[PDB]
Amino acid sequence: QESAWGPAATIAARQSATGTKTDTPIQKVPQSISVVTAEEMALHQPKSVKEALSYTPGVSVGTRGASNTYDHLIIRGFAAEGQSQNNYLNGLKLQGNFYNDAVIDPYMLERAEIMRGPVSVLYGKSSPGGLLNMVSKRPTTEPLKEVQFKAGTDSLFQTGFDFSDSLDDDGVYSYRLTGLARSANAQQKGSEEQRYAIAPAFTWRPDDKTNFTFLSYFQNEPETGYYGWLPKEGTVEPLPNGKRLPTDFNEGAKNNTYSRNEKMVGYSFDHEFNDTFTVRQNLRFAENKTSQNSVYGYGVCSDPANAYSKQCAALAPADKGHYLARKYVVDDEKLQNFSVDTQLQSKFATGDIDHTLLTGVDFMRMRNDINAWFGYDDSVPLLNLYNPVNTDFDFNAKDPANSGPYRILNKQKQTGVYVQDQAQWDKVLVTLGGRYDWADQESLNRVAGTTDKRDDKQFTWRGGVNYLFDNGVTPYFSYSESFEPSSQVGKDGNIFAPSKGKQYEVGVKYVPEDRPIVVTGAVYNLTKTNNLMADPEGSFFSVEGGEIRARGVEIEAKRPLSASVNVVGSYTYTDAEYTTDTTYKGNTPAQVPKHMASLWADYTFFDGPLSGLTLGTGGRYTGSSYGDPANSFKVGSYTVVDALVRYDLARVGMAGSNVALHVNNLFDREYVASCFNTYGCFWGAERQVVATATFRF
Amino acid sequence: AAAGGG
Numbered sequence: 250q251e252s253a254w255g256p257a258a259t260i261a262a263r264q265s266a267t268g269t270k271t272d273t274p275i276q277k278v279p280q281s282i283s284v285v286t287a288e289e290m291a292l293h294q295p296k297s298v299k300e301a302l303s304y305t306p307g308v309s310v311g312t313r314g315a316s317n318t319y320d321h322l323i324i325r326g327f328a329a330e331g332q333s334q335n336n337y338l339n340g341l342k343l344q345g346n347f348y349n350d351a352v353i354d355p356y357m358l359e360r361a362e363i364m365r366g367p368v369s370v371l372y373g374k375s376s377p378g379g380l381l382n383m384v385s386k387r388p389t390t391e392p393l394k395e396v397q398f399k400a401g402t403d404s405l406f407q408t409g410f411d412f413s414d415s416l417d418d419d420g421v422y423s424y425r426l427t428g429l430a431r432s433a434n435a436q437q438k439g440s441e442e443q444r445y446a447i448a449p450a451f452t453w454r455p456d457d458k459t460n461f462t463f464l465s466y467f468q469n470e471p472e473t474g475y476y477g478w479l480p481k482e483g484t485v486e487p488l489p490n491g492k493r494l495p496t497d498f499n500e501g502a503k504n505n506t507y508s509r510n511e512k513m514v515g516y517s518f519d520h521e522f523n524d525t526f527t528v529r530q531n532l533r534f535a536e537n538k539t540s541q542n543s544v545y546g547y548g549v550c551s552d553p554a555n556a557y558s559k560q561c562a563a564l565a566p567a568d569k570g571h572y573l574a575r576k577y578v579v580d581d582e583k584l585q586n587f588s589v590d591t592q593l594q595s596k597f598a599t600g601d602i603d604h605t606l607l608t609g610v611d612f613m614r615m616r617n618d619i620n621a622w623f624g625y626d627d628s629v630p631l632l633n634l635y636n637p638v639n640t641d642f643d644f645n646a647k648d649p650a651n652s653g654p655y656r657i658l659n660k661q662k663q664t665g666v667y668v669q670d671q672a673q674w675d676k677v678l679v680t681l682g683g684r685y686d687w688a689d690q691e692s693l694n695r696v697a698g699t700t701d702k703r704d705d706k707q708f709t710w711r712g713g714v715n716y717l718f719d720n721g722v723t724p725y726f727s728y729s730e731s732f733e734p735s736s737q738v739g740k741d742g743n744i745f746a747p748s749k750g751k752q753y754e755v756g757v758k759y760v761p762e763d764r765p766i767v768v769t770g771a772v773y774n775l776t777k778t779n780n781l782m783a784d785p786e787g788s789f790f791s792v793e794g795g796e797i798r799a800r801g802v803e804i805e806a807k808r809p810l811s812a813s814v815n816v817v818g819s820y821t822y823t824d825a826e827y828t829t830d831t832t833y834k835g836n837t838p839a840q841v842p843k844h845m846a847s848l849w850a851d852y853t854f855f856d857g858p859l860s861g862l863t864l865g866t867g868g869r870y871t872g873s874s875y876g877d878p879a880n881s882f883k884v885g886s887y888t889v890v891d892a893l894v895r896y897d898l899a900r901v902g903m904a905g906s907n908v909a910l911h912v913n914n915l916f917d918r919e920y921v922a923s924c925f926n927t928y929g930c931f932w933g934a935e936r937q938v939v940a941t942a943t944f945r946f
Numbered sequence: 947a948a949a950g951g952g
């Protein structure tokens with residue numbers, strides 16, 4: 250009944266197309282896949298997809314703490330190169346570049362699915378760690394007329410609506426319009442967040458074998474919020490005076506500004522010719538823009554990073570411990586992305602062996618025009634952490650003695666051909682597939698007049714086996730590969746070769762056909778080779794041949810034991826380490842915790858005086874982690890508790906509607922989410938309380 | 947700072 254591209258009946262999804270690009274039951278997928286449903290999201294009312302993943306195993310949602318500027322993730326100890334997202338929407342990648350990275354609001358999603366480990370065999374170039382694939386809402390079967398009001402701490406105000414219906418009797422034409430407007434203050438003083446998004450959609454079904462769904466998304470964010478750096482001195486450890494910087498501290502200029510604009514049009518098309526062939530096609534064109542005027546910190550004056558800062562030097566050595574150095578960046582980017590994935594799915598048998606053959610052509614073009622300016626060492630006055638003074642900063646005064654321009658035009662293109670077969674004999678299922686990619690990149694420096702290019706040709710494949718016992722328990726194992734081009738240039742003035750990803754995984758999945766439960770467990774060995782590292786000569790350039798190894802255990806469970814009880818919980822153990830690095834051999838990558846775990850549960854009363862009342866609570870534990878690649882310090886572990894109070898408005902004469910109270914970080918725990926270096930730390934989110942009223946007419 | 951190195 251449930252479709253991999255539609256809504257899931259409960260908190261536990263059983264269908265998914267991220268792992269195979271075919272509507273496949275999760276037990277028959279030889280890889281780890283997590284699915285966060287719109288229903289689960291409604292439980293926590295997240296502002297970003299990143300927050301919605303707070304309970305998902307093998308995924309770290311704290312690389313920026315409370316900031317939701319980007320949905321940047323670390324999956325199984327890995328992230329894309331250059332601090333870029335690695336997100337997909339409806340099976341096509343939202344290829345971003347530099348600061349130009351698109352973001353989709355959770356209110357517009359039907360699902361948020363996480364794919365752990367290599368996936369190039371189906372998607373092309375990608376980080377070894379995995380990818381995020383969001384699935385847009387689509388026109389509903391029955392009518393939908395929802396209006397939602399939100400009000401919470403830090404002056405958060407949100408109003409949204411979701412409408413869907415047919416325009417004719419037979420249901421040949423249906424539409425769906427979703428929108429929201431949100432204004433709120435950032436956790437840190439002086440910063441604000443604003444978002445206005447609308448998502449028009451239409452589905453045309455000339456016949457029962459043909460579906461054409463138009464999908465568009467328009468979003469404007471005059472202000473995306475805070476995105477600065479705080480030093481470890483004042484966050485993880487106290488300042489020389491034994492005090493810490495408040496969680497709402499802001500080291501940026503008072504006139505800092507960060508904005509983003511997103512425009513997307515595209516469609517999803519499928520047609521079944523007969524029981525043997527089905528054609529499927531997804532395409533999207535995106536034009537995203539982003540601008541910022543940002544003064545950010547760069548750590549205290551005693552920090553190695555500020556070795557030769559004429560401003561830090563002119564300070565009493567005793568004073569270097571509470572003065573924070575800062576820099577600025579004026580950015581302005583424009584990006585266009587065009588993507589098309591066309592598939593042919595064939596179902597046929599060879600004896601007792603049933604087949605599902607997938608062959609497709611997948612390609613994308615992307616260009617990003619960057620016109621920025623960067624301030625160097627003494628480009629912005631020091632900030633006295635003992636007596637912080639927030640003032641306007643003149644971004645126009647581009648002093649050539651301490652700042653320079655940065656105008657680049659990056660172009661990327663990738664075309665790939667892939668084939669996959671899911672052959673099943675009795676209770677055995679074998680997933681085999683391969684993909685060949687042509688990935689070309691070109692970077693033109695407008696200032697220098699230079700131009701760097703590189704054409705890559707990589708082949709990747711994946712094989713695995715699933716055994717389906719007639720009881721729901723189905724063990725499995727698989728081997729998958731991936732590749733990730735570099736954009737770095739070396740001594741010889743050439744772009745390096747792409748690093749690679751190789752993973753071995755064994756696990757078990759329990760999915761009973763009688764009960765709505767899903768439980769998964771997995772053990773894996775992921776390794777990234779040809780990673781870039783420091784030069785053994787020390788020529789300010791980077792060398793190849795580096796290697797990082799990640800291995801761990803993940804177990805996730807989600808299920809509605811009954812009509813009044815839902816349960817979600819997960820556990821993650823991840824041991825990442827540099828196995829070959831001229832500088833960090835033996836260390837563990839920063840921002841990567843060894844242990845994580847979460848448990849959530851909600852109960853609903855159908856009788857007694859509490860009827861129509863839903864109560865929930867959960868906790869999320871994040872192990873400790875290293876604050877830099879040199880492992881010179883650690884970020885303490887932390888535990889956060891969430892709560893929920895929903896009240897079905899059926900008792901008062903309004904079925905389908907409800908009012909709720911959401912609480913994140915119930916005990917207002919004050920913690921440092923993570924640091925990527927001594928001068929780059931982030932406070933976690935302080936307690937948040939949201940009042941929600943969603944009405945359906 | 948665009949980021950690996952910064």
Ligand SMILES: CCCCCCCC[S@@](=O)CCO
Pocket residue numbers: 394410412426
């Ligand atoms: C915010 C835009 C909503 C458009 C829908 C307006 C009402 C028409 S339909 O929802 C009921 C028809 O009887």
Ligand SMILES: CCCCCCCC[S@@](=O)CCO
Pocket residue numbers: 398399400908909940941942
């Ligand atoms: C205080 C309990 C009532 C629940 C919230 C109902 C909607 C009000 S607020 O969410 C939007 C105000 O514009």
Ligand SMILES: CCCCCCCC[S@@](=O)CCO
Pocket residue numbers: 400401402403404405940
């Ligand atoms: C009608 C619902 C009222 C809930 C919103 C109350 C004000 C929140 S914000 O104005 C101050 C937060 O400290």
Ligand SMILES: CCCCCCCC[S@@](=O)CCO
Pocket residue numbers: 408430
């Ligand atoms: C349907 C809700 C509409 C609320 C949006 C009101 C205008 C905010 S933005 O358009 C201008 C901000 O200065």
Ligand SMILES: CCCCCCCC[S@@](=O)CCO
Pocket residue numbers: 406407408430431432443
């Ligand atoms: C019911 C109408 C509420 C929608 C408006 C939400 C806030 C955006 S705008 O009103 C202020 C922008 O600073």
Ligand SMILES: CCCCCCCC[S@@](=O)CCO
Pocket residue numbers: 445469471
């Ligand atoms: C239904 C409300 C329509 C008014 C929206 C006007 C534009 C708001 S956004 O597009 C720019 C905000 O600065």
Ligand SMILES: CCCCCCCC[S@@](=O)CCO
Pocket residue numbers: 900901908
């Ligand atoms: C905050 C307003 C929400 C509506 C709840 C009204 C009272 C429900 S119960 O007190 C009586 C039920 O008949």
Ligand SMILES: CCCCCCCC[S@@](=O)CCO
Pocket residue numbers: 394396410946
């Ligand atoms: C924010 C726009 C919402 C306007 C729609 C109000 C309800 C009318 S329709 O949704 C149901 C008619 O029975």
Ligand SMILES: [Fe+3]
Pocket residue numbers: 332947948949
């Ligand atoms: Fe950055």
